[PDB]
Scaffold this active site. Structure first.
Site, PDB file in Angstrom:
ATOM      1  N   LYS A  17      -9.814  -5.299   3.387  1.00 17.01           N
ATOM      2  CA  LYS A  17     -11.054  -5.172   4.173  1.00 17.01           C
ATOM      3  C   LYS A  17     -11.557  -3.736   4.247  1.00 17.01           C
ATOM      4  CE  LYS A  17     -11.805  -6.157   8.813  1.00 17.01           C
ATOM      5  NZ  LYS A  17     -10.362  -5.806   8.759  1.00 17.01           N
ATOM      6  N   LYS A  36      -5.017   4.241  -2.266  1.00 15.56           N
ATOM      7  CA  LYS A  36      -5.564   3.254  -1.347  1.00 15.56           C
ATOM      8  C   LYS A  36      -6.669   3.951  -0.600  1.00 15.56           C
ATOM      9  CE  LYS A  36      -3.567  -0.579   0.985  1.00 15.56           C
ATOM     10  NZ  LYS A  36      -2.230  -1.248   0.904  1.00 15.56           N
ATOM     11  N   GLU A  85       2.935   5.325  -4.246  1.00 19.13           N
ATOM     12  CA  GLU A  85       3.702   5.012  -5.446  1.00 19.13           C
ATOM     13  C   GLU A  85       3.024   3.840  -6.125  1.00 19.13           C
ATOM     14  OE1 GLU A  85       7.923   2.853  -6.773  1.00 19.13           O
ATOM     15  OE2 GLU A  85       7.777   3.908  -4.838  1.00 19.13           O
ATOM     16  N   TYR A  86       3.015   3.869  -7.446  1.00 22.48           N
ATOM     17  CA  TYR A  86       2.353   2.830  -8.235  1.00 22.48           C
ATOM     18  C   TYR A  86       3.378   1.882  -8.845  1.00 22.48           C
ATOM     19  CZ  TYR A  86       0.958   1.079 -12.793  1.00 22.48           C
ATOM     20  OH  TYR A  86       0.807   0.310 -13.924  1.00 22.48           O
ATOM     21  N   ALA A  87       3.128   0.592  -8.708  1.00 28.21           N
ATOM     22  CA  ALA A  87       4.111  -0.398  -9.103  1.00 28.21           C
ATOM     23  C   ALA A  87       3.579  -1.183 -10.277  1.00 28.21           C
ATOM     24  CB  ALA A  87       4.444  -1.315  -7.948  1.00 28.21           C
ATOM     25  N   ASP A 130       5.439  -8.235   8.664  1.00 24.11           N
ATOM     26  CA  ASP A 130       4.390  -8.791   7.773  1.00 24.11           C
ATOM     27  C   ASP A 130       4.819  -8.903   6.309  1.00 24.11           C
ATOM     28  OD1 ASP A 130       1.952  -9.915   6.975  1.00 24.11           O
ATOM     29  OD2 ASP A 130       0.951  -7.971   6.814  1.00 24.11           O
ATOM     30  N   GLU A 134       2.142 -11.320  -0.955  1.00 27.98           N
ATOM     31  CA  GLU A 134       1.044 -10.410  -1.305  1.00 27.98           C
ATOM     32  C   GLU A 134       1.456  -8.968  -1.065  1.00 27.98           C
ATOM     33  OE1 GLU A 134      -2.822 -11.428  -0.072  1.00 27.98           O
ATOM     34  OE2 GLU A 134      -2.278 -13.257   1.046  1.00 27.98           O
ATOM     35  N   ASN A 135       2.540  -8.796  -0.330  1.00 28.15           N
ATOM     36  CA  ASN A 135       2.958  -7.475   0.110  1.00 28.15           C
ATOM     37  C   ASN A 135       4.117  -6.988  -0.689  1.00 28.15           C
ATOM     38  OD1 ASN A 135       1.012  -7.276   1.979  1.00 28.15           O
ATOM     39  ND2 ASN A 135       2.380  -7.144   3.755  1.00 28.15           N
ATOM     40  N   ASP A 148       2.990  -1.975   2.208  1.00 29.53           N
ATOM     41  CA  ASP A 148       2.221  -2.242   3.418  1.00 29.53           C
ATOM     42  C   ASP A 148       3.033  -2.293   4.692  1.00 29.53           C
ATOM     43  OD1 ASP A 148      -0.743  -4.294   3.640  1.00 29.53           O
ATOM     44  OD2 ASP A 148       0.114  -2.830   5.056  1.00 29.53           O
TER      45      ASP A 148
END
Ligand SMILES: O=C(Nc1c[nH]nc1-c1nc2ccc(C[NH+]3CCOCC3)cc2[nH]1)c1ccc(F)cc1
Length: 263
Positions: A17, A36, A85-87, A130, A134-135, A148
């Site tokens: 969002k 982000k 960090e990029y996954a 959470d 998706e996380n 997240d």
């Protein structure tokens, strides 16, 4: 410390969002990471700024192979920037749509990686709460990386509620508005685990209201192909009573784990 002009923005990695995450390279380091992008605008409007700088707190002083690094942050006028960090290997969510179901050996592994990840976290009285597909990001090794830490929180606490959010992974206590500690995350691990094998979460519904009941009454059933050891561990994880939920350690030690946990 950092600023936008220090980066070359790459391709969009996804949504949310408050903005998008982009691939990006650090200009003079050639370092690859994810950015982000969060608009101040929307963070205040939707009164969450409190959360942000807590997600930042926690996920910063955190260090674990199975937890997405946060290198830092910064802002300008229009927005705030999160240097992640990029996954390489996308989300477990995506791998799930992709494969429809995971097998016992893939599931087990994730649970392990997940357990240990969470283990480290509780040790610092940090509760995620959470945890959902998706996380979950994948490192190159193909390994899990809990992203997240928005809702993330200290101590054994009570949250500022607000109902408007997917209940699917919430434990009874949380949802019922009650006393919730670090036992939540074991309920989560149970759901996660069930979803991995069956392909949907065990409490899925068509309405917020039905799920609430379903979760509140712990109503779940196993398709036939779910093996016994699976059933066992899931059943053990999904107790209405936080107190009866195993300790993370027990989950590692569970025989269906260790039979199957490649990693
Ligand atoms: O911030 C996010 N993701 C990431 C943080 N760090 N690294 C990521 C990340 N996500 C992806 C997704 C895809 C890929 C590339 N990969 C190529 C092969 O097929 C699968 C996708 C990399 C990546 N990194 C993110 C992901 C999903 C959202 F809905 C919202 C935000």
């Amino acid at each position: 410390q950092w600023a936008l002009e220090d980066f070359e923005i790459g391709r969009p990695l996804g949504k949310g969002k408050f903005g998008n995450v982009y691939l990006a390279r650090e200009k003079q380091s050639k370092f690859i990471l994810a950015l982000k992008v969060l608009f101040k605008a929307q963070l205040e409007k939707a009164g969450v700024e409190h959360q942000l700088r807590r997600e930042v707190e926690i996920q910063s002083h955190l260090r674990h192979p199975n937890i997405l690094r946060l290198y830092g942050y910064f802002h300008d006028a229009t927005r705030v920037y999160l240097i992640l960090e990029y996954a390489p290997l996308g989300t477990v969510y995506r791998e799930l749509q992709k494969l429809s179901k995971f097998d016992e050996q893939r599931t087990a592994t994730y649970i392990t990686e997940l357990a240990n990840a969470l283990s480290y976290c509780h040790s610092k009285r940090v509760i995620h709460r959470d945890i959902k597909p998706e996380n979950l990001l994948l490192g190159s090794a193909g390994e899990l990386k809990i992203a997240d830490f928005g809702w993330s929180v200290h101590a054994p606490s009570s949250r500022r509620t607000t109902l408007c959010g997917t209940l699917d992974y919430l434990p009874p206590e949380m949802i019922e508005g009650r006393m919730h500690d670090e036992k939540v995350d074991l309920w989560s691990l149970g759901v996660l685990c069930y979803e991995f094998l069956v392909g949907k979460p065990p409490f899925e519904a068509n309405t917020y209201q039905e799920t609430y009941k379903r979760i509140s009454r712990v109503e779940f059933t196993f398709p036939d192909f779910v093996t016994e050891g699976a059933r066992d561990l899931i059943s053990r994880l999904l107790k209405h009573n936080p107190s009866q939920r195993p300790m993370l350690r027990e989950v590692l030690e569970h025989p269906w784990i260790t039979a199957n946990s490649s990693k």
